[PDB]
């Protein structure tokens, strides 16, 4: 999905289709970040909450 | 012979200086503007047929309308220099001459070049404003040219109204430079917005503003 096709889907204006093509249909990921320091260095554990 | 071309250059330069002094808001009577050439040769050249620059200086007072619309406008002093390579000498004495009568703006036309050590002698004449120009520049009035449209400097408020209509800050406008011939033709300073009225072939008349630095 080259940069030029990105430029075309910007020319049409479908922002949701782009946000889809570059997320769900490829590689989505989740990161827990802090709010004071602002880094992806949060040590998280879920089933213990 | 070679006399008439020099005399013609000096004449055109003087006329352009007067029109420049007319668009900035001051007052020049029509007996001075419509000067023909025999008056110039008869009243400027010596019996040898050679000029005296010290007989071309003059003072200028503002009109009432321009005094009302633009408040920070004093008087104008125009003096053509005498020496060719303007160094520290003529610059210093000229600065004293402006610091003497306490007038507000002076125009020091040079001929060939100005020395840099004297080019530092311009922030030393405050609160006045000395503005330098070369002579070989003002032979042609750039405003009668086809492309260049009208530039109209604004007042203090109207600017505030313009910044209210678009909800802006003074840094987010198209800019013009402090050294750009149609920006010193009007004598701009940092924070003054010139209005431009360009022609357009999709709506005829298009008004576009532009700020200085």
């Amino acid at each position: 999905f080259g940069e030029m096709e990105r430029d075309c889907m910007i020319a049409h204006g479908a922002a949701g289709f782009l946000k889809e093509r570059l997320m769900e249909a490829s590689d989505a990921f989740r990161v827990h970040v802090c709010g004071i320091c602002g880094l992806m260095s949060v040590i998280a554990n879920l089933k213990k909450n | 012979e070679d006399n008439n071309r020099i005399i013609s250059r000096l004449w055109r330069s003087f006329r352009t200086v007067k029109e420049m002094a007319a668009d900035r808001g001051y007052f020049i009577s029509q007996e001075e503007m419509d000067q023909s050439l025999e008056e110039f040769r008869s009243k400027i050249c010596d019996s040898m047929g050679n000029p005296q620059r010290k007989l071309m200086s003059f003072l200028a007072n503002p009109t009432p309308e321009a005094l009302e619309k633009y408040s920070d406008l004093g008087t104008l002093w125009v003096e053509f220099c005498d020496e060719p390579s303007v160094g520290i000498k003529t610059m210093r004495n000229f600065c004293l001459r402006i610091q003497e009568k306490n007038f507000s703006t002076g125009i020091f036309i040079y001929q060939n070049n100005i020395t840099p050590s004297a080019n530092k002698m311009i922030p030393t004449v405050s609160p006045a404003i000395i503005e330098t120009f070369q002579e070989s520049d003002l032979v042609v009035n750039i405003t009668h040219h086809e492309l260049v449209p009208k530039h109209i400097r604004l007042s203090d408020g109207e600017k505030s109204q313009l910044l209210q209509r678009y909800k802006l800050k003074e840094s987010q406008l198209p800019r013009i430079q402090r050294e750009d011939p149609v920006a010193r033709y009007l004598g701009l300073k940092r924070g003054q917005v010139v209005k431009i009225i360009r022609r357009s072939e999709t709506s005829g008349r298009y008004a576009s503003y532009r700020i200085c630095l």
Partner: protein, 242 residues
């Protein structure tokens, strides 16, 4: 084959530079064409607010022609019989010759058209090329108004002149590109549409309505409404990465 092998990639890289240069210039909700951080590039998009797919080449009748033919086309004189509107095209042709009340109107309108002539001829289109892209196709609306209402013939009209002059004059001011009631918005609204007003005033003048198009009343109203509707449909859309 060699030249073909050479230039295409050059043009491609050139296009990449252009696109990577111009890819954040938007049209915000009031006509400004700002970049990513507010440097107003164009104060009003395209100088007129129109789109790009909506304009068509049209002719502006006023510019070309000689003064005698222009006068023969637009001038009206109710006093003298020979140079007035024909009698067999209007029913009310007996209640006309003599009332200055209306020769006033006609004189003022003709002076306005002279102002448009000198304006467009001197300042803008210097060479005089009378063919330029503009919105709203007028002639199609005209002959559509002729077909839908059968208005052909052989018949006299019933349209009054004050509805004509006051109709066009009250139309030319309902064409909104910028709204609000501040003075700057009003002047911008005045300049944004001037060539188009010269077009409408150039087409729908009186003799070219009662002596060439031969409309009536209902069709006239339908036409003004149509012009308003289409002009309101042919504007740019805020949110358009131009």
């Amino acid at each position: 084959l060699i030249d073909t092998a050479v230039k295409t990639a050059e043009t491609g890289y050139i296009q990449r530079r252009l696109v990577k240069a111009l890819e954040d210039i938007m049209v915000h909700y009031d006509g400004t064409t700002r970049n990513s951080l507010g440097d107003i590039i164009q104060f009003l998009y395209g100088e007129d607010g129109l789109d790009g797919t909506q304009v068509e080449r049209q002719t502006i009748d006023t510019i070309p022609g000689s003064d005698k033919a222009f006068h023969k086309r637009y001038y009206v004189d109710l006093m003298d019989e020979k140079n007035s509107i024909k009698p067999d095209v209007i029913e009310y042709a007996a209640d006309i010759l003599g009332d200055v009340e209306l020769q006033k109107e006609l004189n003022s309108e003709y002076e306005q058209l002279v102002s448009d002539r000198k304006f467009l001829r001197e300042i803008v289109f210097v060479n005089g090329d009378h063919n330029w892209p503009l919105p709203v196709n007028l002639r199609r609306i005209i002959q559509n108004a002729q077909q839908i209402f059968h208005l052909d013939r052989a018949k006299a009209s019933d349209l009054t002149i004050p509805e004509i002059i006051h109709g066009v004059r009250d139309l030319c001011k309902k064409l909104f590109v910028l709204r609000g009631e501040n003075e700057l918005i009003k002047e911008a609204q005045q300049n944004a549409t001037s060539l188009f007003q010269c077009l409408v005033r150039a087409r729908l003048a009186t003799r070219r309505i009662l002596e060439e198009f031969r409309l009536n009343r209902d069709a006239f109203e339908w036409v003004l409404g149509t012009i308003e509707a289409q002009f309101q449909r042919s504007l740019v859309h805020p949110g358009e990465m131009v």
